[PDB]
Amino acid sequence: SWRHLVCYLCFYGFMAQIRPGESFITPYLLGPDKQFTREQVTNEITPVLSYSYLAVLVPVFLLTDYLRYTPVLLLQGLSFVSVWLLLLLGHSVAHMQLMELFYSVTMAARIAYSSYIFSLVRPARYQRVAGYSRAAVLLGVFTSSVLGQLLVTVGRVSFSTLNYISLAFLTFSVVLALFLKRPKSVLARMLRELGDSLRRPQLRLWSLWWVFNSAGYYLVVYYVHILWNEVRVYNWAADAASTLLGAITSFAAGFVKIRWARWSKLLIAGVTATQAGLVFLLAHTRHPSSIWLCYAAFVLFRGSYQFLVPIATFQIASSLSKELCALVFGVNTFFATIVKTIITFIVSDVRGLGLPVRKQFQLYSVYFLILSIIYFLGAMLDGLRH
Ligand SMILES: CN(Cc1cnc2nc(N)nc(N)c2n1)c1ccc(C(=O)N[C@@H](CCC(=O)O)C(=O)O)cc1
C-alpha cells in the first residue's frame, strides 16, 4: 500500500469517470436506433432523474459510512453498467426510466469516493489526497468528454458503438473498484455526532459554503449549457476546457498551503466574488464577440469552484471527530440540491418569478453577489473579535 493506495485510488477515480457515450445519451435516444419523440425524452426522462437524485441520495449518504465505502463504490459502478446495459436494450419508456433511476443512484453515490479518499489516509495529508483525487476525477471527466467528441466528430463511429465502448470502460471501472480495500438508537448517536461536529467553526463554514455555492455553481452550469445552445461545435470544446481547468485548479488547491481558520472566510469571499464577476460577465454578452470572452469566462468560473472543491472536503475531514466524513458530504449535497431546486422553482418556473435565461443569469450573478458580501462580512466580524 506504499505506492498502490493513493496512486491506485486516483487511477480508479480517473477510470470510473470515463464514459465517452455519456454526453451523447440524448442524441442516441432521439437517434435512429431508438424511435423516441422529442417530447418524451424530455418529459419522462429528465424529471425522473431529477426526483430520484433527491430520493436515492438519502439512503446512500445514510448507509455509505456504515458500509465502509467499498460496497457503495461497487454499487455506483454496477449502476453505471446497468445504465449502459439498459441504454443498449432500451425496449420501452419504462426501461429508460429505470436507466435514469440508476443514473441518479450513481450521482448520489459519487460522494462515496470523496469520503473514501479521506477514510483511506492518515489525517495529516487530507488536503494533498483531496487535491489528487479531485484532479483525477476531473481529468477523467475531461478525458471522457474529449474521447466521445473525438470519436464522434473527428472520428467515425455510431452511437451504438460509442455506447459499447462506454460499457466496456464501465466494466473495467467495476473491475478496478472490486480490488479497492475496505477500511476497518444508532441514528440518535449519529445525529448527536453530526450536531457536535457542526458546532465547530470550520466544518460549519465550509458546510454552508457547500450548500450554497455548490448549488449556485450547479445552477450556473446547467443553465450555461442552455444559454449557449440558445444564442455548436465549440460548445464541447468550452466544456472540456472548463473541466481541464477545474482539474488543474483542484491539483493546485491540493498543493496550496495557507494558514486556515484565519484566511479561510476571506478566501471563500474572494473566490465567490470572482465567480460572481465571471457570471455577470457571462450574462452581459450579446455582441458578436461572444465566443472568446464569455466561453473562457465560464471556464474560469468552473475552475474557481473546483479550486474550492478539494479544500472544502478536506476542511470537513480535518474537523470531524468520528468516521462521519460521508454523512456530512451527503447532507451538504442533499441540501445544496434542495437549494438549487428551490432557486429553479423561484426563478425558472412560470408560476413563480418566471424570467428568461438572460435575467435568470442576472439573478444567479446577484445570488453570488449576496453570497460574496456575506462571507466578506464574515472575515471582518471575526477579525473584529480578535
Ligand atoms: C447531468 N450529467 C450528464 C447527463 C447528460 N445527459 C443526460 N441525458 C439523459 N437523457 N440522461 C442523463 N442522465 C443525462 N446525464 C452530468 C451530471 C454530473 C456530471 C458530473 O460528473 N459533474 C461534476 C464533475 C465531478 C464528478 O465527476 O462527480 C461537475 O463538476 O459538474 C457530469 C454530467
Curated annotation (Swiss-Prot):
Where does this protein chiefly localize? membrane
Query: Changing I45A: reported impact?
Result: Reduces methotrexate uptake
Annotated region (Required for substrate-binding) at: 336-348
Q: Which residues are glycosylated?
A: Q35
| KW Electron transport (keyword) present | no
Membrane topology, as annotated: Multi-pass membrane protein
Query: Where, by residue number, does the polypeptide cross the bilayer?
Result: 7-27, 42-64, 69-89, 94-116, 131-155, 161-179, 203-228, 234-256, 263-283, 290-313, 328-351, 360-384
Effect listed in the UniProt record for changing I25A = Reduces methotrexate uptake. Reduces methotrexate uptake
Q: What is the similarity comment for this entry?
A: Belongs to the reduced folate carrier (RFC) transporter (TC 2.A.48) family.
Q: Summarize the protein's role.
A: Antiporter that mediates the import of reduced folates or a subset of cyclic dinucleotides, driven by the export of organic anions. Acts as an importer of immunoreactive cyclic dinucleotides, such as cyclic GMP-AMP (2'-3'-cGAMP), an immune messenger produced in response to DNA virus in the cytosol, and its linkage isomer 3'-3'-cGAMP, thus playing a role in triggering larger immune responses. Mechanistically, acts as a secondary active transporter, which exports intracellular organic anions down their concentration gradients to facilitate the uptake of its substrates.
Protein name in the entry: Reduced folate transporter
